[PDB]
Design an enzyme around this catalytic site. Structure first.
Site, PDB file in Angstrom:
ATOM      1  N   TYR A 161       0.763  -1.236   0.000  1.00  0.00           N
ATOM      2  CA  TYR A 161       0.000   0.000   0.000  1.00  0.00           C
ATOM      3  C   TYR A 161       0.800   1.297   0.000  1.00  0.00           C
ATOM      4  O   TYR A 161       0.223   2.387  -0.008  1.00  0.00           O
ATOM      5  CB  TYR A 161      -1.037  -0.049   1.138  1.00  0.00           C
ATOM      6  CG  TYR A 161      -2.157  -1.042   0.849  1.00  0.00           C
ATOM      7  CD1 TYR A 161      -1.972  -2.076  -0.073  1.00  0.00           C
ATOM      8  CD2 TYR A 161      -3.393  -0.957   1.495  1.00  0.00           C
ATOM      9  CE1 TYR A 161      -2.977  -3.001  -0.347  1.00  0.00           C
ATOM     10  CE2 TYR A 161      -4.413  -1.884   1.227  1.00  0.00           C
ATOM     11  CZ  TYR A 161      -4.194  -2.905   0.303  1.00  0.00           C
ATOM     12  OH  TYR A 161      -5.171  -3.842   0.027  1.00  0.00           O
TER      13      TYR A 161
ATOM     14  N   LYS B  45       1.831 -14.997   4.314  1.00  0.00           N
ATOM     15  CA  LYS B  45       1.948 -15.830   3.133  1.00  0.00           C
ATOM     16  C   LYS B  45       3.449 -16.095   3.001  1.00  0.00           C
ATOM     17  O   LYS B  45       4.031 -15.961   1.925  1.00  0.00           O
ATOM     18  CB  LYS B  45       1.421 -15.112   1.892  1.00  0.00           C
ATOM     19  CG  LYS B  45       1.215 -16.048   0.707  1.00  0.00           C
ATOM     20  CD  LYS B  45       0.024 -16.989   0.914  1.00  0.00           C
ATOM     21  CE  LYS B  45      -0.034 -18.036  -0.193  1.00  0.00           C
ATOM     22  NZ  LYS B  45      -1.306 -18.824  -0.213  1.00  0.00           N
TER      23      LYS B  45
ATOM     24  N   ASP C 255      -4.349 -17.532   3.636  1.00  0.00           N
ATOM     25  CA  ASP C 255      -5.510 -18.081   2.938  1.00  0.00           C
ATOM     26  C   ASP C 255      -6.330 -18.954   3.895  1.00  0.00           C
ATOM     27  O   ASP C 255      -7.541 -18.773   4.023  1.00  0.00           O
ATOM     28  CB  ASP C 255      -5.092 -18.866   1.683  1.00  0.00           C
ATOM     29  CG  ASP C 255      -3.981 -19.859   1.942  1.00  0.00           C
ATOM     30  OD1 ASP C 255      -3.493 -19.942   3.087  1.00  0.00           O
ATOM     31  OD2 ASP C 255      -3.590 -20.556   0.986  1.00  0.00           O
TER      32      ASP C 255
ATOM     33  N   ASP D  90      -5.977  -5.495   5.412  1.00  0.00           N
ATOM     34  CA  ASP D  90      -7.024  -4.712   4.769  1.00  0.00           C
ATOM     35  C   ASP D  90      -8.178  -5.630   4.385  1.00  0.00           C
ATOM     36  O   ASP D  90      -9.346  -5.324   4.632  1.00  0.00           O
ATOM     37  CB  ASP D  90      -6.477  -4.024   3.512  1.00  0.00           C
ATOM     38  CG  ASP D  90      -7.535  -3.223   2.783  1.00  0.00           C
ATOM     39  OD1 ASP D  90      -8.203  -2.407   3.443  1.00  0.00           O
ATOM     40  OD2 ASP D  90      -7.696  -3.400   1.557  1.00  0.00           O
TER      41      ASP D  90
HETATM   42  N1  LIG Z   1      -2.617 -26.253  -4.166  1.00  0.00           N
HETATM   43  C1  LIG Z   1      -1.939 -26.782  -3.146  1.00  0.00           C
HETATM   44  O1  LIG Z   1      -1.323 -27.834  -3.324  1.00  0.00           O
HETATM   45  C2  LIG Z   1      -1.901 -26.143  -1.809  1.00  0.00           C
HETATM   46  C3  LIG Z   1      -3.023 -25.095  -1.494  1.00  0.00           C
HETATM   47  C4  LIG Z   1      -2.815 -24.556  -0.092  1.00  0.00           C
HETATM   48  C5  LIG Z   1      -1.810 -24.921   0.793  1.00  0.00           C
HETATM   49  N2  LIG Z   1      -0.859 -25.898   0.365  1.00  0.00           N
HETATM   50  C6  LIG Z   1       0.177 -26.293   1.366  1.00  0.00           C
HETATM   51  O2  LIG Z   1      -0.111 -26.969   2.430  1.00  0.00           O
HETATM   52  C7  LIG Z   1       0.630 -26.986   3.560  1.00  0.00           C
HETATM   53  C8  LIG Z   1      -0.382 -26.735   4.884  1.00  0.00           C
HETATM   54  O3  LIG Z   1      -0.799 -25.586   4.647  1.00  0.00           O
HETATM   55  P1  LIG Z   1      -2.155 -25.030   5.616  1.00  0.00           P
HETATM   56  O4  LIG Z   1      -2.059 -25.753   6.884  1.00  0.00           O
HETATM   57  O5  LIG Z   1      -2.116 -23.576   5.745  1.00  0.00           O
HETATM   58  O6  LIG Z   1      -3.513 -25.469   4.909  1.00  0.00           O
HETATM   59  P2  LIG Z   1      -4.352 -26.593   4.429  1.00  0.00           P
HETATM   60  O7  LIG Z   1      -3.601 -27.719   4.133  1.00  0.00           O
HETATM   61  O8  LIG Z   1      -5.428 -26.208   3.373  1.00  0.00           O
HETATM   62  O9  LIG Z   1      -5.002 -26.848   5.814  1.00  0.00           O
HETATM   63  C9  LIG Z   1      -5.900 -25.829   6.552  1.00  0.00           C
HETATM   64  C10 LIG Z   1      -7.139 -26.319   7.188  1.00  0.00           C
HETATM   65  O10 LIG Z   1      -8.095 -26.568   6.113  1.00  0.00           O
HETATM   66  C11 LIG Z   1      -8.925 -27.695   6.541  1.00  0.00           C
HETATM   67  N3  LIG Z   1      -8.819 -28.672   5.427  1.00  0.00           N
HETATM   68  C12 LIG Z   1      -7.990 -28.662   4.306  1.00  0.00           C
HETATM   69  N4  LIG Z   1      -8.144 -29.661   3.506  1.00  0.00           N
HETATM   70  C13 LIG Z   1      -9.127 -30.403   4.096  1.00  0.00           C
HETATM   71  C14 LIG Z   1      -9.756 -31.622   3.710  1.00  0.00           C
HETATM   72  N5  LIG Z   1      -9.412 -32.235   2.607  1.00  0.00           N
HETATM   73  N6  LIG Z   1     -10.747 -32.149   4.536  1.00  0.00           N
HETATM   74  C15 LIG Z   1     -11.104 -31.501   5.691  1.00  0.00           C
HETATM   75  N7  LIG Z   1     -10.558 -30.343   6.120  1.00  0.00           N
HETATM   76  C16 LIG Z   1      -9.560 -29.828   5.274  1.00  0.00           C
HETATM   77  C17 LIG Z   1      -8.425 -28.081   7.868  1.00  0.00           C
HETATM   78  O11 LIG Z   1      -9.162 -27.251   8.958  1.00  0.00           O
HETATM   79  P3  LIG Z   1      -9.147 -27.510  10.519  1.00  0.00           P
HETATM   80  O12 LIG Z   1      -7.754 -27.417  10.946  1.00  0.00           O
HETATM   81  O13 LIG Z   1     -10.013 -26.463  11.022  1.00  0.00           O
HETATM   82  O14 LIG Z   1      -9.683 -28.869  10.675  1.00  0.00           O
HETATM   83  C18 LIG Z   1      -6.998 -27.602   7.762  1.00  0.00           C
HETATM   84  O15 LIG Z   1      -6.176 -27.832   8.902  1.00  0.00           O
HETATM   85  C19 LIG Z   1       1.779 -25.968   3.121  1.00  0.00           C
HETATM   86  O16 LIG Z   1       3.051 -26.271   2.717  1.00  0.00           O
HETATM   87  C20 LIG Z   1       0.904 -25.147   2.108  1.00  0.00           C
HETATM   88  O17 LIG Z   1       1.791 -24.227   1.148  1.00  0.00           O
HETATM   89  C21 LIG Z   1      -0.865 -26.521  -0.904  1.00  0.00           C
END
Ligand SMILES: NC(=O)c1ccc[n+]([C@@H]2O[C@H](COP(=O)([O-])OP(=O)(O)OC[C@H]3O[C@@H](n4cnc5c(N)ncnc54)[C@H](OP(=O)(O)O)[C@@H]3O)[C@@H](O)[C@H]2O)c1
Ligand SMILES: NC(=O)c1ccc[n+]([C@@H]2O[C@H](COP(=O)([O-])OP(=O)(O)OC[C@H]3O[C@@H](n4cnc5c(N)ncnc54)[C@H](OP(=O)(O)O)[C@@H]3O)[C@@H](O)[C@H]2O)c1
Lengths: 495, 495
Positions: free
Chosen positions: A143, A190, A223, A247
């Site tokens: 910003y 992030k 995110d 923000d």
């Molecule tokens: N496109 C991708 O491959 C991608 C996208 C995002 C993140 N990541 C990576 O993941 C790793 C962990 O990141 P993060 O902990 O911030 O996020 P995350 O893996 O999306 O996990 C965050 C929360 O989302 C819920 N959640 C995600 N997937 C779920 C599923 N399949 N079923 C039920 N609940 C689900 C859980 O909530 P509760 O804890 O409340 O149960 C979880 O602890 C990192 O290295 C990150 O960069 C990869």
């Protein structure tokens, strides 16, 4: 004269005991919301003196591009306390945000945005006990608006995150948590993507946390944080994050308890404090006497407490809450604009309720806390060793990667530099990757020093002049190592 | 062999009519979610052949820093269609996101993230008919990860927005809207602050909109957008925004209908398509057979329809929806991890329901649409005139603004340049503003050309060498005007 309270806050106390503040009407709905607020203040006999000054669009229209006239700067330096209505910032063109200018000119580094459920202000989350506060870093990150058109079709904005600024904001967050009885602070970043910039906040958070063993420090990726704030907001108490992230998240949270018309905020610094609503000028409602002034009113309440005028703060806050609890005079943003009470009617009702106190939702006046001093801040570390190991040269050209690569290798021949790789929009394109990446006319060319010691300025400029003999460069970045660690990242797809 | 369908999409069709796809198990919960999905696919007799390859953390651990091995790139170039589980990206350190690398390597510029309410998946928004889709620009903006430590304590990330990338993403959004029967597209930006970068998306949006008079084009500032998405999400249909903004808003919307366990996505490009859930590797649930595989499953369904295997897509999706409608086997993210069905049990239930009648037959309404071609894209305009008018020199020093200003004016004496101003973290500090801005050891010094014509490279390098005789520079930015307009912005507080 201007005095320093025992809490360390600066405020202008007049001989008659009243406290002089700077008041900024603002743009759009601004004046209406501020006008309403001032009326409630006067009725409550708030011990205040007012110095009205302008900022925002009205000043841009005077031909003052910063939107902050000298008289306003003088007033703020005199009062150190400001109540401002929203200021309009042109979208996509024109002048830079005068809101950001005020914060940056006066180092109000912390933007406190509390959210709570309100009486007769229904939301799908009613009854879940949402009570959190977003502590948004207020003076750096994106910003700042430092932009350059790298080429006629490629724009660049700099995102700057400093240890100094990150250390300040996280410490403020912990002090705030400890001062409101909250035992947990979440740091949303992030840092998985921006390891250096966002990672600076994560690292400052972790180091400062060690000084607050009484508070639980939890890091969360931004995110997932947005997802959690909507799915289960009652799990949060204090959330600290960088400027842009804050923000978006703070506005996300306001939608959980009624919308922007109920979102107040405080811009806090060691030398100045600016109170304002989180919402904007909202041009489609300006002058229609239908806008909800609750946000600005609650900001004035935050200001009153800051001023140590706790009695008036409770009086005004109780009246407002009482008015909401009764649910007879509600603004359009709550009951629709076909029924909503007029702004002036809403004000009058609240004033009529001065002296009355709600039964349920009451004032939760926390305890004031001294702002961290510079002498106690964790100073940035001076590397024991550092060296310039190369230079990133950004060029504007439509020449394909392979040809650009050979051309630059030829130009670097004879210099103590070698072309390591070339990227486009951050993706390695030379050496080829086997991908199908589409290209823009902007390339970052990484040159690494090949001699002993480090790359000296004359050698670097010589390399750049050679590149310039054929290509248009517009951006240079030195590549440095601090204590054996590269102060730069690799390109996407680069092994 | 790889073929091009009459719709323009490329897919690998084997001699037996099976479509060969690349499958990436991923990290953490990835394998479990993918494993399940493959089971449902095989049961539904999906006409697919699988080429399993790795990407992500398991590859970083092989010493391949990009996390994308050559065999995987080879496989994707062969199939052009990918189903991947989440990939772990280290937080605050280590390797760059392999998820971002896959998208950038194969120009899958559009990230489609549809959100809708699900049967027996309670949310406070149930019954409001939330049915929207976020179209997130997928290959530029900040997530590129181009970073440099300007000084030991000041980090910088580049935010790059191109006309090419912006033009493509907004056109995709309009085509998607027109293809799903949506009559409105919202473009969320922070163009009020980043007039050049975010404003590029705004301007591309408005110009491309002229080609879709059948669609209502609405611009909205990103902060208000988050507020609106929480307060009244049912007003939105299609939302198009830049990379980082979309990352946050898309996760915000997922929390409106059940969480990340129910958020599928499609990474679409002209030459490649990658299907994956919006969620991550979720390390704490890894290997515990409790993770909800719905998101990945639905992504495979999006993949099936991309492959024109509509029958299988409907079969699998109906089975899934039927299971949710019956509400006998719900995962931990819906009913709690104390009573939630195991991943394998949830899977089994769905397979058992292959062929049932979802009462609310809400098989999503989708219609295939041809992707815009390059020959039809609005090409960036070549300026009629352009000139270099100066240079921004960034230096590392703790010398106070006033003295720095004088020192630089002395160094520029004799050159065709004059020091216009100096900023710190984007705030003008020279000439003085009367503010109380705190300073970091990084300053941007703006020099303007004072001669006739434009500033030439030799003159610029000469000025830089003079600055270098006393100060450490690390970052140069040429200041250019295109068609009479400055390709750069002023500092905050600068009139
Ligand atoms: N496109 C991708 O491959 C991608 C996208 C995002 C993140 N990541 C990576 O993941 C790793 C962990 O990141 P993060 O902990 O911030 O996020 P995350 O893996 O999306 O996990 C965050 C929360 O989302 C819920 N959640 C995600 N997937 C779920 C599923 N399949 N079923 C039920 N609940 C689900 C859980 O909530 P509760 O804890 O409340 O149960 C979880 O602890 C990192 O290295 C990150 O960069 C990869
Ligand atoms: N600190 C500041 O001074 C500040 C903060 C943000 C924006 N702004 C500026 O404001 C201008 C307009 O920006 P914007 O339209 O995106 O946002 P905005 O002014 O906050 O308006 C967005 C929506 O928020 C609701 N809202 C805001 N204030 C309200 C109030 N007091 N009572 C009831 N509802 C309220 C309305 O929702 P509905 O439309 O749903 O009724 C409104 O249209 C710009 O130049 C922008 O930069 C200034």
């Amino acid at each position: 004269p201007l005095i320093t309270t025992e809490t360390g806050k600066k405020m202008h106390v007049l001989e008659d005991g009243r406290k002089l503040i700077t008041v900024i009407p603002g743009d759009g709905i601004g004046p209406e919301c501020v006008e309403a607020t001032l009326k409630v203040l006067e009725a409550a006999k708030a011990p205040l003196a007012y110095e009205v000054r302008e900022a925002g669009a009205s000043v841009f229209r005077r031909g003052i591009a910063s939107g902050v006239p000298q008289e306003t700067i003088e007033s703020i330096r005199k009062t150190r306390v400001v109540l401002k209505g929203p200021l309009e910032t042109p979208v996509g063109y024109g002048e830079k945000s005068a809101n950001v200018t005020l914060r940056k000119l006066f180092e109000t580094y912390a933007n406190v945005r509390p959210v709570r459920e309100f009486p007769n202000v229904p939301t799908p989350y009613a009854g879940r006990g949402i009570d959190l506060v977003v502590v948004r870093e207020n003076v750096e990150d994106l910003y700042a608006g430092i932009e350059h058109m790298q080429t006629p079709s490629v724009a660049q904005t700099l995102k700057l995150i400093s240890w100094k600024g990150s250390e300040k904001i996280v410490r403020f967050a912990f002090e705030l948590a400890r001062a409101e009885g909250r035992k947990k602070v979440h740091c949303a970043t992030k840092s998985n993507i921006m390891k250096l910039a966002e990672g600076t906040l994560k690292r400052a958070f972790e180091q400062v946390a060690q000084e607050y063993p009484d508070i639980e420090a939890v890091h969360i990726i931004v995110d997932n944080a947005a997802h959690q704030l909507v799915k289960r907001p009652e799990q949060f108490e204090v959330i600290v994050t960088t400027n842009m992230n804050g923000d978006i998240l703070s506005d996300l949270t306001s939608g959980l308890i009624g919308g922007l018309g109920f979102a107040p905020s405080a811009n806090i610094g060691n030398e100045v404090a600016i109170f304002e609503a989180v919402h904007g000028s909202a041009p489609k409602y300006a002058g229609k006497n239908v806008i909800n002034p609750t946000a600005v009113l609650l900001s004035a309440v935050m200001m009153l407490r800051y001023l140590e005028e706790f009695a008036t703060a409770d009086l005004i806050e109780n009246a407002l809450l009482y008015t909401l609890e009764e649910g007879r005079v509600l603004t359009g943003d709550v009951v629709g604009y076909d029924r909503g009470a007029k702004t002036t009617e809403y004000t009058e009702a609240i004033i009529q309720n001065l002296g009355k106190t709600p039964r349920k939702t009451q004032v939760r006046g926390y305890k004031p806390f001294r702002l961290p001093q510079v002498d106690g801040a964790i100073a940035p570390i001076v590397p024991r060793s550092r060296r310039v190991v190369g230079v990133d040269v950004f060029v504007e050209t439509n020449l394909l990667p392979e040809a650009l690569g050979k051309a630059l290798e030829d130009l670097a021949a004879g210099t103590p530099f070698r072309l390591k790789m070339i990227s486009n929009r951050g993706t390695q394109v030379y050496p080829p990757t086997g991908g199908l990446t589409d290209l823009v006319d902007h390339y970052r060319c990484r040159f690494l020093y090949t001699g002993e010691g480090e790359a000296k300025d004359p050698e670097i400029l010589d390399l750049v002049s050679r590149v310039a003999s054929r290509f248009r460069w517009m951006h240079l970045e030195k590549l440095q190592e601090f204590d054996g660690e590269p102060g730069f990242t690799k390109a996407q797809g680069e092994d």
